[PDB]
Amino acid sequence: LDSSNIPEHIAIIMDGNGRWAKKRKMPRIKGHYEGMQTIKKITRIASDIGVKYLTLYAFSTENWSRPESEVNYIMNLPVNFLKTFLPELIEKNVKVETIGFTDKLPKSTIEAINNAKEKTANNTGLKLIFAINYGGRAELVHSIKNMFDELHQQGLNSDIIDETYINNHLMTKDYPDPELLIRTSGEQRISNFLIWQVSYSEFIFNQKLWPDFDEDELIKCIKIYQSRQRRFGGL
Amino acid sequence: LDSSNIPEHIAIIMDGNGRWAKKRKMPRIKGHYEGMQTIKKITRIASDIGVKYLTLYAFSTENWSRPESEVNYIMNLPVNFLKTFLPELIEKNVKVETIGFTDKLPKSTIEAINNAKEKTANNTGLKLIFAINYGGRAELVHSIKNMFDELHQQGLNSDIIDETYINNHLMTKDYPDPELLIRTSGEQRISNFLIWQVSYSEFIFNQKLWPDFDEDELIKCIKIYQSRQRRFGGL
Ligand SMILES: CC(C)=CCC/C(C)=C/CC/C(C)=C/COP(=O)(O)OP(=O)(O)O
Ligand SMILES: CC(C)=CCC/C(C)=C/CC/C(C)=C/COP(=O)(O)OP(=O)(O)O
Numbered sequence: 001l002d003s004s005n006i007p008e009h010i011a012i013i014m015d016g017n018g019r020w021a022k023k024r025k026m027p028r029i030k031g032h033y034e035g036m037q038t039i040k041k042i043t044r045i046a047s048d049i050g051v052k053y054l055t056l057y058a059f060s061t062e063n064w065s066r067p068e069s070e071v072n073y074i075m076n077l078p079v080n081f082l083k084t085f086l087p088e089l090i091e092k093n094v095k096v097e098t099i100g101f102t103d104k105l106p107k108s109t110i111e112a113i114n115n116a117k118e119k120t121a122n123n124t125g126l127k128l129i130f131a132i133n134y135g136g137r138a139e140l141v142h143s144i145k146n147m148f149d150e151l152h153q154q155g156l157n158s159d160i161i162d163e164t165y166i167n168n169h170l171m172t173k174d175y176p177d178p179e180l181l182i183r184t185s186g187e188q189r190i191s192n193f194l195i196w197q198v199s200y201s202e203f204i205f206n207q208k209l210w211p212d213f214d215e216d217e218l219i220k221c222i223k224i225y226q227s228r229q230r231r232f233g234g235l
Numbered sequence: 236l237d238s239s240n241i242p243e244h245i246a247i248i249m250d251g252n253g254r255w256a257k258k259r260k261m262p263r264i265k266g267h268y269e270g271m272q273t274i275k276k277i278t279r280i281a282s283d284i285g286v287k288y289l290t291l292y293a294f295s296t297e298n299w300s301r302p303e304s305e306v307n308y309i310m311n312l313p314v315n316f317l318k319t320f321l322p323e324l325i326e327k328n329v330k331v332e333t334i335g336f337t338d339k340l341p342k343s344t345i346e347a348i349n350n351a352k353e354k355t356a357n358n359t360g361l362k363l364i365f366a367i368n369y370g371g372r373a374e375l376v377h378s379i380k381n382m383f384d385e386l387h388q389q390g391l392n393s394d395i396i397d398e399t400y401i402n403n404h405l406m407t408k409d410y411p412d413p414e415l416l417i418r419t420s421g422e423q424r425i426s427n428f429l430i431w432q433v434s435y436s437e438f439i440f441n442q443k444l445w446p447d448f449d450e451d452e453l454i455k456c457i458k459i460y461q462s463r464q465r466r467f468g469g470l
């Protein structure tokens with residue numbers, strides 16, 4: 001890797017958990033258990049190579065359509081993840097954050113995530129950002145409702161609204177846009193993830209199912225990214 | 236092709252014109268001339284197989300950064316395209332439309348496009364939609380400014396705003412979202428194209444440079460699309 005060109009913000013769509021379990025004739029939830037564990041692997045390497053922000057698509061606003069047993073299992077898994085891994089996150093200087101409508105989560109999940117946020121609030125290393133009950137269209141709807149009230153309450157007109165003003169009212173207002181979006185499993189689509197923020201991101205569609213995605217694969221994606229030629233509409 | 240599953244709306248990022256000319260040691264504008272001609276090829280096949288909407292990314296809000304000679308050439312090419320091809324568009328029942336901030340175009344280009352719009356306004360076949368001076372972030376900024384005024388002038392609160400209401404205030408309010416987004420040249424990014432509307436589109440990153448993209452290649456992309464398994468967040 002060119003150590004002077006580590007991306008600041010990698011976003012990942014963690015797809016293929018279900019297929020990983022079905023290849024092994026196991027229930028879909030087993031694939032989610034293993035995908036939860038794989039988050040720990042990827043968090044370690046991203047932190048050790050100096051990525052600043054890692055956003056993971058854990059549960060979309062459309063995933064409520066799935067069987068309740070699967071929704072409940074995914075929504076409970078942060079409790080298991082933090083019980084075993086929070087001490088290492090604190091020691092590695094990682095700061096835990098979320099984006100999405102996290103008030104809809106089980107109360108025990110809200111409590112475990114709030115505890116992890118408070119215990120890492122002053123950490124200055126990798127920001128590990130879980131997008132949970134998150135979707136780009138609903139993010140924009142919410143941000144638009146807030147900008148409408150804010151401008152009216154500040155006695156302002158919509159002439160102030162520009163692309164920059166929108167950036168600063170999104171759930172991702174404190175993060176740069178990702179340079180790199182990775183999706184595993186070989187699907188080629190963004191599925192409502194960060195749709196405003198990925199306007200000029202490089203995309204990598206990695207063929208491994210998420211539970212098989214490991215440190216070496218992350219490094220291979222970064223090396224591919226370092227070969228891309230970004231132009232932002234110019235020459 | 237499965238004739239019962241022709242996508243209704245294909246969106247295409249027409250990339251690689253510059254590289255096509257540079258491979259031949261020709262100026263970049265020559266590649267744009269040839270890309271203009273290739274639009275005619277693709278319009279014919281899309282219309283003959285029964286695609287309903289074809290949106291082409293002709294000039295982005297970021298492409299103003301490019302050399303003025305190149306911007307002027309691209310902005311003038313619709314005049315040449317319509318002079319030679321408008322009669323065939325009228326006979327093929329195609330309806331010409333645009334999205335973007337088309338008031339910024341040369342006056343002779345505005346006149347030629349307005350003439351083509353008027354002469355095809357009642358056509359019921361393929362909608363051939365040029366995205367010219369178009370970008371998804373600026374589209375959203377403009378739509379947001381309009382929704383803020385509309386709600387205030389109708390004595391409404393922002394509680395009405397939902398994903399549907401946004402769809403109905405975009406430049407693409409009269410089009411379904413594309414099932415398929417194709418980008419030529421092997422770049423893997425969306426570059427501000429239709430960023431709200433492609434939330435669940437299938438992506439195909441075709442390796443041909445745009446002037447080499449032909450009917451056979453379009454049909455191959457549709458056959459790939461017909462093999463994709465779309466899930467919209469569910470199982
Ligand atoms: C700390 C924390 C957030 C833990 C929870 C992590 C976790 C298990 C997120 C689920 C991610 C998800 C919906 C993957 C999609 O694979 P898929 O089900 O679509 O797989 P398929 O396409 O092969 O069926
Ligand atoms: C009717 C009508 C709208 C005519 C005009 C069509 C036309 C020539 C559009 C230009 C499309 C464009 C900016 C392609 C990008 O290739 P690129 O310049 O980025 O190629 P490169 O990446 O290989 O340099």
Ligand SMILES: [Mg+2]
Binds near residue numbers: 015016
């Ligand atoms: Mg999936």
Ligand SMILES: [Mg+2]
Binds near residue numbers: 250251
């Ligand atoms: Mg290009």
